[PDB]
């Protein structure tokens, strides 16, 4: 008794006003947007989309292979180009709440951007106890605009890599291969330089608990580096100073 009408349950399907809001926006950000909407909506001709399966690992599977499969799962959700934000992410939520969201993201299987990927990367690597995970944020400048981008830094047995999502191949995944944290960060700085972006700020998070019931928040801004005020060698030493206060804390 009691037909389900669970207004507190999230997930697709979404209401008709929200649905229109996306298509209205699509006509605005695409040259022939109205024709895109007309052709996609109602067409009985749309491909089926499979739900990506979250990888499962044998206990003997090495951590670098697990990282590649985790990054690949994150990629097959696809980068969100639709104009919409599909998930509301409050960065000050307790980790346990952020992990509920990550699980929901795996069940809804919608496109994502950089922050969803960071959340998913933590969720999907909590089960790897020898892997340290910590967010890395970049603020860049280009052509009259400031841009913000975040990835999940990782450390496996002394080597630094990264999981993430970006429109650019060189601004996300990095295999755990760098010997130092400054090499990982300078690698992202070079990739930004390739596209004439000026790196203004690097924010280094603290390492994130592996306990998915943890009520602690993520420390997103444990170290903040003003790269232009630092120069070059003070930058490298401040990065190595955070990494040591990361391995001792």
């Amino acid at each position: 008794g009691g037909v389900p009408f669970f207004v507190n349950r999230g997930g697709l399907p979404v209401d008709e006003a929200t649905w229109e809001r996306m298509w209205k926006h699509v006509a605005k950000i695409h040259p022939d947007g109205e024709k895109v909407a007309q052709r996609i909506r109602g067409a009985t001709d749309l491909p089926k989309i499979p739900i990506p399966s979250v990888p499962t690992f044998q206990p003997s599977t090495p951590v670098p292979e697990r990282l590649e499969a985790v990054q690949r799962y994150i990629r097959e959700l696809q980068y969100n180009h639709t104009g919409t934000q599909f998930f509301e992410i409050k960065k000050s939520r307790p980790l346990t709440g952020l992990m509920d969201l990550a699980k929901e993201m795996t069940k809804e299987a919608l496109p994502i951007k950089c922050l969803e990927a960071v959340i998913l990367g933590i969720y999907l690597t909590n089960s790897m106890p020898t892997l340290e995970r910590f967010p890395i944020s970049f603020k860049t400048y280009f052509s009259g605009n400031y841009f913000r981008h975040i990835v999940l830094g990782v450390n496996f047995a002394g080597r630094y890599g990264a999981l993430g999502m970006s429109r650019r191949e060189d601004l996300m995944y990095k295999p755990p291969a760098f010997r130092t944290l400054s090499e990982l960060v300078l690698d992202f700085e070079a990739a930004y330089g390739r596209c004439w972006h000026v790196l203004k700020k690097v924010k280094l998070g603290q390492s994130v608990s592996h306990d998915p019931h943890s009520v602690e928040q993520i420390e997103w801004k444990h170290s903040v580096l003003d790269v232009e005020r630092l120069g070059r060698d003070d930058f490298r030493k401040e990065l190595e100073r955070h990494a040591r206060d990361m391995r001792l804390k």
Binding site: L12, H81, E108, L110
Partner: peptide
């Protein structure tokens, strides 16, 4: 389930839309 059908329709339309927007973005 008519809700399940609406769900699958919306998600299918979301990814078709994302396909078109990626093609626009990647060619620029």
């Amino acid at each position: 389930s008519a809700q399940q059908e609406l769900k699958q329709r919306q998600r299918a339309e979301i990814y078709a839309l994302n396909r078109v927007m990626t093609e626009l973005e990647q060619q620029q």
